[PDB]
């Protein structure tokens, strides 16, 4: 049958495509883990981030999110000893800050995950592009969303990382018209 052309090879990526990718997520932890790890793709390929994504969980998932917000600069330097993932004490520091800004949003009982949803009018977006080139990476919500995270102090929010967030987060549905799941004319 027809399938998404986003993947050229690497069977691991396709498995990730079927697992989620394009499925709207409302979990704050899933969105936080996506925006933080997505920064790794910068310069690196999407496949590189997925492999390290699993290793990243080994160093951060066990510590949980609230803990990093409660960790000190010595903790990031201590784990740096293990580089199973890209090495960059500066990037690790962003993780601690990510939990600090994220935790502040919860203090008002308003998850920051709900905030991004409001940027798209709490309404899901869908597209019927035929080729990947037809899909535009410049959208009014993606540009405004990056400015919002930048204000929070989030790093690695380039417009490219922002568009990737909606793609993995599922805010927008971009699976061309040859992915079976996306018909475009078959209700
Ligand atoms: Zn697809």
Curated annotation (Swiss-Prot):
<keyword id="KW-0378">Hydrolase</keyword>
<dbReference type="InterPro" id="IPR011257">
    <property type="entry name" value="DNA_glycosylase"/>
</dbReference>
<dbReference type="GO" id="GO:0008725">
    <property type="term" value="F:DNA-3-methyladenine glycosylase activity"/>
</dbReference>
<keyword id="KW-0479">Metal-binding</keyword>
<feature type="binding site">
    <location>
        <position position="179"/>
    </location>
    <ligand>
        <name>Zn(2+)</name>
    </ligand>
</feature>
<dbReference type="GO" id="GO:0006307">
    <property type="term" value="P:DNA alkylation repair"/>
</dbReference>
<keyword id="KW-0234">DNA repair</keyword>
<feature type="binding site">
    <location>
        <position position="175"/>
    </location>
    <ligand>
        <name>Zn(2+)</name>
    </ligand>
</feature>
<dbReference type="GO" id="GO:0006284">
    <property type="term" value="P:base-excision repair"/>
</dbReference>
<feature type="binding site">
    <location>
        <position position="4"/>
    </location>
    <ligand>
        <name>Zn(2+)</name>
    </ligand>
</feature>
<keyword id="KW-0862">Zinc</keyword>
<dbReference type="GO" id="GO:0046872">
    <property type="term" value="F:metal ion binding"/>
</dbReference>
<dbReference type="InterPro" id="IPR005019">
    <property type="entry name" value="Adenine_glyco"/>
</dbReference>
<protein>
    <recommendedName>
        <fullName>DNA-3-methyladenine glycosylase 1</fullName>
        <ecNumber>3.2.2.20</ecNumber>
    </recommendedName>
</protein>
<keyword id="KW-0227">DNA damage</keyword>
<dbReference type="InterPro" id="IPR052891">
    <property type="entry name" value="DNA-3mA_glycosylase"/>
</dbReference>
<feature type="binding site">
    <location>
        <position position="17"/>
    </location>
    <ligand>
        <name>Zn(2+)</name>
    </ligand>
</feature>
<dbReference type="Pfam" id="PF03352">
    <property type="entry name" value="Adenine_glyco"/>
</dbReference>
<comment type="function">
    <text>Hydrolysis of the deoxyribose N-glycosidic bond to excise 3-methyladenine from the damaged DNA polymer formed by alkylation lesions.</text>
</comment>
<dbReference type="InterPro" id="IPR004597">
    <property type="entry name" value="Tag"/>
</dbReference>
């Amino acid at each position: 049958m027809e399938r998404c052309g986003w993947v050229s090879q690497d069977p691991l990526y396709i498995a990730y495509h079927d697992n989620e990718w394009g499925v709207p997520e409302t979990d704050s932890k899933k969105l936080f883990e996506m925006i933080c790890l997505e920064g790794q793709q910068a310069g690196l390929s999407w496949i590189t981030v997925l492999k390290k994504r699993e290793n990243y969980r080994a160093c951060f998932h066990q510590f949980d999110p609230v803990k990093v917000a409660a960790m000190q600069e010595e903790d990031v330097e201590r784990l740096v000893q293990d580089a199973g993932i890209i090495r960059h004490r500066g990037k690790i520091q962003a993780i601690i800050g990510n939990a600090r800004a994220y935790l502040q949003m919860e203090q008002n009982g308003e998850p920051f995950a709900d905030f991004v949803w409001s940027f798209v009018n709490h309404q899901p977006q869908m597209t019927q592009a035929t080729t990947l080139s037809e899909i535009p990476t410049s959208t009014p919500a993606s540009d405004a969303l990056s400015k919002a995270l930048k204000k929070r102090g989030f790093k690695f929010v380039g417009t490219t990382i922002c568009y990737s967030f909606m793609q993995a987060c599922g805010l927008v549905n971009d699976h061309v018209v040859g992915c079976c799941c996306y018909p475009g004319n078959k209700p």
